[PDB]
Amino acid sequence: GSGTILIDLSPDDKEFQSVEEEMQSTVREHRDGGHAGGIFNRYNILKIQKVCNKKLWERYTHRRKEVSEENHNHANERMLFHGSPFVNAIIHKGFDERHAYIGGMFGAGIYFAENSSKSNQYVYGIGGGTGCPVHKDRSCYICHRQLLFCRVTLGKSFLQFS
Amino acid sequence: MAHSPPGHHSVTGRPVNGLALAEYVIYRGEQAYPEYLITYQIMRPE
Numbered sequence: 001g002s003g004t005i006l007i008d009l010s011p012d013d014k015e016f017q018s019v020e021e022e023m024q025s026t027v028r029e030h031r032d033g034g035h036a037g038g039i040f041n042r043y044n045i046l047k048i049q050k051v052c053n054k055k056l057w058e059r060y061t062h063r064r065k066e067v068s069e070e071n072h073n074h075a076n077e078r079m080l081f082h083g084s085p086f087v088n089a090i091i092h093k094g095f096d097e098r099h100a101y102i103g104g105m106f107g108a109g110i111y112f113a114e115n116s117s118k119s120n121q122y123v124y125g126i127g128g129g130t131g132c133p134v135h136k137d138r139s140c141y142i143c144h145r146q147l148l149f150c151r152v153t154l155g156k157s158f159l160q161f162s
Numbered sequence: 163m164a165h166s167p168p169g170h171h172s173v174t175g176r177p178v179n180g181l182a183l184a185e186y187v188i189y190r191g192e193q194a195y196p197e198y199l200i201t202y203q204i205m206r207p208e
């Protein structure tokens with residue numbers, strides 16, 4: 001009784017098509033030559049579901065208004081990818097301290113990527129962990145993977161050059 | 163979980179690699195909503 005329902009999008013739905021295009025068009029090559037996420041230029045999209053949770057949405061919009069009011073009515077809202085072994089916990093209970101990357105280069109926070117292929121490196125854990133649970137393959141072409149495409153409030157963002 | 167830099171709500175990791183896009187960090191779970199769950203396979207290059 002989390003309150004989360006998943007609605008399947010038809011591949012004929014403009015909403016399915018725009019989400020697939022963001023997934024496919026933000027693939028890049030990684031400096032690890034595919035060690036963490038695997039070797040690929042594109043995805044086979046199997047399903048796109050809308051995540052519906054009244055409580056978690058109101059939790060988001062409440063915080064968004066707080067940030068907006070601290071930043072001249074500008075939430076600075078983005079659509080960004082998140083890969084995690086805990087995607088099931090996230091869609092049911094929301095993001096929290098447990099989804100934080102303790103060892104992250106920008107501190108113990110929750111990390112999001114413009115590149116879908118960057119988020120893909122984290123589906124099986126930090127640095128791809130031991131890869132897919134079935135084949136222990138970080139480059140598995142068989143096992144089904146999941147990413148979240150997330151609405152994120154940045155507000156006033158601290159610019160860190162790398 | 164750490165705090166945002168004082169006077170900030172998030173961090174932007176600006177990409178050496180001219181082709182890399184930005185990474186972002188929030189320090190409040192409430193600042194993200196998981197809108198879409200995408201199920202996929204990576205494809206072996208031809």
Ligand SMILES: COc1ccc2c(=O)[nH]c3sccc3c2c1
Binds near residue numbers: 084101118119
């Ligand atoms: C360092 O940059 C990133 C970029 C994207 C992600 C991501 O999608 N999920 C996770 S889960 C723990 C770390 C990360 C991460 C880190």
Ligand SMILES: [Zn+2]
Binds near residue numbers: 133141142
């Ligand atoms: Zn596998």
